[PDB]
């Protein structure tokens, strides 16, 4: 149903489990036969990663006009490292 992701400053992000599986990293962790600690990711980054999950699940296989996923220059480097770490 939902998974709880924890950021480095202790913000808790509760997202649908199907959405969280957008992350190859999370998908492999939860793939066996819930809370996940992401203490290396600050909340201004992890909140954007969760928005990405929603956006990927909404717009993948969609024939609508797809809006740009917005990224402010000042979060780009950390978000890039999170996306890389998270595989999404």
């Amino acid at each position: 149903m939902y998974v709880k992701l924890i950021s480095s400053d202790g913000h808790e992000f509760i997202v649908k489990r199907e959405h969280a599986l957008t992350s190859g990293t999370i998908k492999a962790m939860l793939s066996g036969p819930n809370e996940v600690n992401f203490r290396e990711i600050p909340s201004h980054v992890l909140s954007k990663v969760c928005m990405y999950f929603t956006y990927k699940v909404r717009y993948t296989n969609s024939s609508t006009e797809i809006p740009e996923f917005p990224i402010a220059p000042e979060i780009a480097l950390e978000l890039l490292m999170a996306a890389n770490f998270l595989d999404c």
Partner: protein
């Protein structure tokens, strides 16, 4: 259509979506499944405006065009106590560091 939301209280943020035609009370039901407090112990807000149980999210101003997956609308959440009043309080996220010189105009 659907509206995409972040329901926020203190240091908790729930990402969820709901139909624009669904009600504030039905969103409290979603919140109850996650945080285990019943609708009559929740206060949901758009900015500082308490949302009436009976109104749809669209009627509260949450519309598909402005509550999109990549930029969800914030719903504030407060809980009731038997004898105290909890101010609505959403803890800000962290701040990024300074944009590196090599990324500046």
């Amino acid at each position: 259509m659907d509206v995409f939301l972040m329901i926020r209280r203190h240091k908790t943020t729930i990402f969820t979506d709901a139909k624009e035609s669904s009600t504030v009370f039905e969103l409290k039901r979603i919140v109850e499944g996650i945080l285990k407090r019943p609708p009559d112990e929740q206060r949901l807000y758009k900015d500082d405006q308490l949302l009436d149980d009976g109104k749809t999210l669209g009627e509260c101003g949450f519309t598909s065009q402005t509550a999109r997956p990549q930029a969800p609308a914030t719903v504030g959440l407060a809980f009731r106590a038997d004898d105290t009043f909890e101010a609505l309080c959403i803890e800000p996220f962290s701040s990024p560091p300074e944009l590196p010189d090599v990324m500046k105009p």
